[PDB]
Amino acid sequence: IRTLLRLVPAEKRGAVAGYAVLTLLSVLLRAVGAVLLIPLLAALFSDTPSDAWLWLGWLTAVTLAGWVTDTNTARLGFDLGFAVLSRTQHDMADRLPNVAMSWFTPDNTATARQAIAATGPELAGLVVNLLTPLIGAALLPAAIGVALLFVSVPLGLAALAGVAVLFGALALSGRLSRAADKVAGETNSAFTERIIEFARTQQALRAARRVEPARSQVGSALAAQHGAGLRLLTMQIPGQVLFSLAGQVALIGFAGMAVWLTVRGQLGVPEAIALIVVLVRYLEPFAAIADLAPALETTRATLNRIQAVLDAPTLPAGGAAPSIEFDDVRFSYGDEVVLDGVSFTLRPGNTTAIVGPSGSGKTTILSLIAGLQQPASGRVLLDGVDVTTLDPEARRAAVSVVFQHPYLFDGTLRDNVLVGDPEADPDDVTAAMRLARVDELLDRLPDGDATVVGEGGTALSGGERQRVSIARALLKPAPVLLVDEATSALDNANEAAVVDALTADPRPRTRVIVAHRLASIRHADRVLFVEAGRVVEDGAIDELLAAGGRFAQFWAQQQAASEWAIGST
Amino acid sequence: AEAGSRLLAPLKKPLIVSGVLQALITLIELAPFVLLVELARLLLGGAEAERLWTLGLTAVSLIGLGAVLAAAMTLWLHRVDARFAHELRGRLLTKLSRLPLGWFTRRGSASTKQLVQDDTLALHYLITHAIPDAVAAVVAPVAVLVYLFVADWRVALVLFIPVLVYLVLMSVMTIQSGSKIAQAPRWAERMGGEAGAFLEGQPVIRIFGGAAASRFRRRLDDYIDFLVSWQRPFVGKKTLMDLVTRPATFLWIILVAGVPLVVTGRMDPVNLLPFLLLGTTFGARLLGIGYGLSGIQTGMLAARRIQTVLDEPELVVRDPGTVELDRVSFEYRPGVPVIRDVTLTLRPGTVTALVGPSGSGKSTLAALVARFHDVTQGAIRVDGRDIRTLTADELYRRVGFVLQDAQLVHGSVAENIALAEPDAGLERIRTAARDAQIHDRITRMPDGYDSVLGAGSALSGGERQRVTIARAILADTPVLVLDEATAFADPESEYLVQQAINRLTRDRTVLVIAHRLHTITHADQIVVLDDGRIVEVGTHDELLAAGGRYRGLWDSG
Numbered sequence A: 001i002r003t004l005l006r007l008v009p010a011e012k013r014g015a016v017a018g019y020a021v022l023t024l025l026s027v028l029l030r031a032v033g034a035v036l037l038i039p040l041l042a043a044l045f046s047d048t049p050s051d052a053w054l055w056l057g058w059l060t061a062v063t064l065a066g067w068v069t070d071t072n073t074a075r076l077g078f079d080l081g082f083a084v085l086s087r088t089q090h091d092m093a094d095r096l097p098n099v100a101m102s103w104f105t106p107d108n109t110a111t112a113r114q115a116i117a118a119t120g121p122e123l124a125g126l127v128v129n130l131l132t133p134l135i136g137a138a139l140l141p142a143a144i145g146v147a148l149l150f151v152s153v154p155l156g157l158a159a160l161a162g163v164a165v166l167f168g169a170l171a172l173s174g175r176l177s178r179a180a181d182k183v184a185g186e187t188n189s190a191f192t193e194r195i196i197e198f199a200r201t202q203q204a205l206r207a208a209r210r211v212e213p214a215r216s217q218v219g220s221a222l223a224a225q226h227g228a229g230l231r232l233l234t235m236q237i238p239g240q241v242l243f244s245l246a247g248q249v250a251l252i253g254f255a256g257m258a259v260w261l262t263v264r265g266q267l268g269v270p271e272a273i274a275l276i277v278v279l280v281r282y283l284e285p286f287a288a289i290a291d292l293a294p295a296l297e298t299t300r301a302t303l304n305r306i307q308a309v310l311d312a313p314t315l316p317a318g319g320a321a322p323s324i325e326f327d328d329v330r331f332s333y334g335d336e337v338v339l340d341g342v343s344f345t346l347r348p349g350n351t352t353a354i355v356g357p358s359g360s361g362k363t364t365i366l367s368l369i370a371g372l373q374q375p376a377s378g379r380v381l382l383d384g385v386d387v388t389t390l391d392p393e394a395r396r397a398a399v400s401v402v403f404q405h406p407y408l409f410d411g412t413l414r415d416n417v418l419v420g421d422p423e424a425d426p427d428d429v430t431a432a433m434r435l436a437r438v439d440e441l442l443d444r445l446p447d448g449d450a451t452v453v454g455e456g457g458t459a460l461s462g463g464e465r466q467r468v469s470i471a472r473a474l475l476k477p478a479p480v481l482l483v484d485e486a487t488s489a490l491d492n493a494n495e496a497a498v499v500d501a502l503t504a505d506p507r508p509r510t511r512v513i514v515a516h517r518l519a520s521i522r523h524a525d526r527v528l529f530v531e532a533g534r535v536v537e538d539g540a541i542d543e544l545l546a547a548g549g550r551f552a553q554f555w556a557q558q559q560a561a562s563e564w565a566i567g568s569t
Numbered sequence B: 001a002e003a004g005s006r007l008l009a010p011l012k013k014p015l016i017v018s019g020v021l022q023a024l025i026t027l028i029e030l031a032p033f034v035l036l037v038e039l040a041r042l043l044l045g046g047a048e049a050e051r052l053w054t055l056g057l058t059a060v061s062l063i064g065l066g067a068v069l070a071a072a073m074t075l076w077l078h079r080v081d082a083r084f085a086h087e088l089r090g091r092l093l094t095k096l097s098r099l100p101l102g103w104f105t106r107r108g109s110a111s112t113k114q115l116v117q118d119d120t121l122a123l124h125y126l127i128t129h130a131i132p133d134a135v136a137a138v139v140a141p142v143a144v145l146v147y148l149f150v151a152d153w154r155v156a157l158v159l160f161i162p163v164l165v166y167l168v169l170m171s172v173m174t175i176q177s178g179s180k181i182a183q184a185p186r187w188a189e190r191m192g193g194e195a196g197a198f199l200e201g202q203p204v205i206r207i208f209g210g211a212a213a214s215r216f217r218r219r220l221d222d223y224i225d226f227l228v229s230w231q232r233p234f235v236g237k238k239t240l241m242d243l244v245t246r247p248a249t250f251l252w253i254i255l256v257a258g259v260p261l262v263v264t265g266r267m268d269p270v271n272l273l274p275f276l277l278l279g280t281t282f283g284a285r286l287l288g289i290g291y292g293l294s295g296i297q298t299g300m301l302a303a304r305r306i307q308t309v310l311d312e313p314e315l316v317v318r319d320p321g322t323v324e325l326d327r328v329s330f331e332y333r334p335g336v337p338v339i340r341d342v343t344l345t346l347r348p349g350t351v352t353a354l355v356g357p358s359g360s361g362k363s364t365l366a367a368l369v370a371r372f373h374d375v376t377q378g379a380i381r382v383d384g385r386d387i388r389t390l391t392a393d394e395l396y397r398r399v400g401f402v403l404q405d406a407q408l409v410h411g412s413v414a415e416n417i418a419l420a421e422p423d424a425g426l427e428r429i430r431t432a433a434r435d436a437q438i439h440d441r442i443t444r445m446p447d448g449y450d451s452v453l454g455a456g457s458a459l460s461g462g463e464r465q466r467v468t469i470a471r472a473i474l475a476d477t478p479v480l481v482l483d484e485a486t487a488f489a490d491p492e493s494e495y496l497v498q499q500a501i502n503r504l505t506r507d508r509t510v511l512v513i514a515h516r517l518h519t520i521t522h523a524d525q526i527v528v529l530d531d532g533r534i535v536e537v538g539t540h541d542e543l544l545a546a547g548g549r550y551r552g553l554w555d556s557g
């Protein structure tokens, strides 16, 4: 397979070539070591056993070479496994930061996790365990066919022609067995879909006093469908039985032809016995490959995963308040246009808001100016410099974000906030601390900023984690600052910290906000109301609110909802 | 194991018969390697053509018999598997309708999807694939070894030399790296978690980088260095193990052991033919036992996983809207209280809220009203009757709860409101919908009240929650249980959800999980839980005047 070659490091080409050469040499010092049985057993069973010693001598003198070249192939295989594991792991870990975020559909993320995590021992033992036995057992039948075609030409031609028959039987057996497994999985999953339908809808049924009728209905359905599980045995019947029967049929056919030639006088009895022995040896590698199938299947799966992650799309590449521009930018994810007709030119150093229904494509805007995803259409620029054409290391110091999910890398509060600018002095850290208001949690936290605030370290609530994110984003010297919306009403101090971020920011830098609740829609300069990725409104805060537009209705609904108390109107 | 044995009770006999038949088939497929030996014997003896015809027809009869049985047994085993898996699926169906409701609420354990769908299929491969393949892989090499020993024990005993070397080297390797093998799966899980954090925390690494970007690379390099330091010092061991198993080394050893014997006249030469036929692959067959036993073990894992589900306790039943709670204490697992010795009482038509940021079993306390689990101590009574003694026909028409993550049944939306009362008329369903403020979206949906719904549907979370509120309205349950998280679950639908909740709560007794402190001012009795127990109780105004924990929390907000 091409990908298994492409995974090779470029430095070990003189190692792969040596591996291939010594593998063919190993094949041709046991294939000849097998055909050399014929002079050996043609003397062993004959009237002159003493002739066996010479051919035994030149059998051991090739088995020793087989040992030496096998050792030199296997040590080289260990080296190549280690240096393909390291090479592909580093290539993946370099690729993934540059992978566009549109790739992380969560089956893709699951496969990437599997490739990164589960492939350690396997790749170290790829050539040693899978490929070397595969090649050494695949070439051996053809090698014996050629070596028994040069010697005793009427029979080697039959052996080489029957290699096709036996490999066809093996391939058909494997194909039918794989299809049988697929069919069994399909039928089993189809029968029990009703049980999952029950389990998901268990609460709504049980509270409705309908659990027993639904249980009876599902039981009746299962009983009705049960009887139709037998008719599709036509493909498991020729499973491993097909390969075993084909192998033994070929065995008996060759043995019968040998006995027929013996009776017809074209061969001697010892020659006809040694031919049978070699024609048994000619079959053994096929059984070895058939035994080796599941390892090949699992390695094909893992190589498919590594190929999929390796070929994932990757972004191209190459201190005042910048100007941010969208030149009629559009973007699509899945099977929908997550961004439709998006264009603007932000005046530098301003505060801007974004609002709309959740799932409408609001955070994807921040992903676009953040450089997380290249634009499908249009241009995204910073002071006219297209982000795709921006230099790689320079792009990472151009923008800052406060995400809807306040990700924390399992450090302390100081350690988490220090992400973005580790070189900042302690007074700057204290100033950002005061601005983000996380110091209020230090009055609650046991060990102050040194407390670990990972997922297992502290059960930090979403507003508080977002506040830590505001601190982190405020610290760094990004020319552009961005904020998202996950401000639950449980923490009003989080809203106060957001307000201070809009208003009390010391540094000069363009500010953009994405907002749902009142505190985050108040002090901006303009709003880009998003709906299904389409910017349906574009205007000032007062302009849109006083005009009675969609933003006005949204603000009215949010304010009315926030004012409610339970127990009366 | 006890769980796996208990689950596979009725299949004790069919599995034994399948094992016997697989042993028979495997012995049949190693028969022609005996008939070729007899063919060589006849050729050396110069037998007439008819005897060789007899042998060559026997070797076709046997390979026809061993291909007819191996499709006329694994055709019987398939329908036996069907007849058992049906009685297991139809048993898990009955067990789903008797487990406690909170078991379905995920405790972080295996999902409802995997725990049946994957495990029934793995049990299928245990019955029809793993056990037959395993008995075949266990009976083939032992039959081969017995045949080679009875043929010529002196040459067969020499075959232990590669086996002894392989086992000795494996024992030397495993002991020499005990710490590494102990560490290996834990390192695998640790780097799996690290990859999960790296992938899930991708945008921070992409936009900030610094420590976050380099942490993954450093940990990955540590893992790769661990693997390299573990495997690289054993190349000379492992390659030497690989050599001694190969067919070529067995062939050379057999020939060097037999040719001196044959030439010296110490054994009849045709006794060496079975070893050349079979013994040359003796090494590569013992290496296949582990795969079959691994398949059996993987199947038994799923067997145990299904068995544990069938062994969990059932929701037992014993024996004006008032609710009474007395000294209740609940623990999810023993030794870990989450509610302890709390006490409460609710008048008919009243409202009660549970507040606190620490949790303190607030959601657990609310769920225990509808007996998602049984209280380890204390009791809960509705209208004077202990909740333990109310079957589902009465309990959940007395107590109609709506918590977070409402689950929608498949069918018409008109039906989907009327699970609690399928006899409800169209006008009744419409009035319930307009009470829940869900009539608008249903009218917007293309087929109106005829429209179907289910797992695949366009309705959002808030719309589905309002649908469930309409269902609860049609249920007409005097006592209720509620979670305030459904209020701010969807800010866009928060107005309509608020109106629906207010309509539902107005005429009916309600107990609420409260998170936002500003949303409870008129509730007749506010409650606060901390340290998994009651600390203060009182109304909003009285608690504010008291200056207790509620006042501090509200001042914080």
Ligand SMILES: Nc1ncnc2c1ncn2[C@@H]1O[C@H](COP(=O)(O)OP(=O)(O)O)[C@@H](O)[C@H]1O
Residues within 6 Å of the ligand: A101, A102, A104, A105, A106, A333, A334, A338, A357, A358, A359, A360, A361, A362, A363, A364, A365, A404
């Ligand atoms: N990695 C991803 N996986 C799945 N869906 C995604 C991903 N990235 C973006 N989307 C899609 O983008 C939409 C959300 O965009 P947006 O509105 O900007 O975020 P939010 O909904 O949090 O405000 C969703 O409809 C979602 O399907």
Ligand SMILES: Nc1ncnc2c1ncn2[C@@H]1O[C@H](COP(=O)(O)OP(=O)(O)O)[C@@H](O)[C@H]1O
Residues within 6 Å of the ligand: B106, B107, B108, B332, B336, B337, B338, B357, B358, B359, B360, B361, B362, B363, B364, B365
């Ligand atoms: N899914 C779960 N898995 C394990 N433990 C849980 C789970 N849900 C609740 N708990 C237990 O309940 C506790 C806290 O009460 P809980 O009702 O979770 O508070 P909250 O309502 O704020 O989430 C913890 O002590 C925890 O052990």
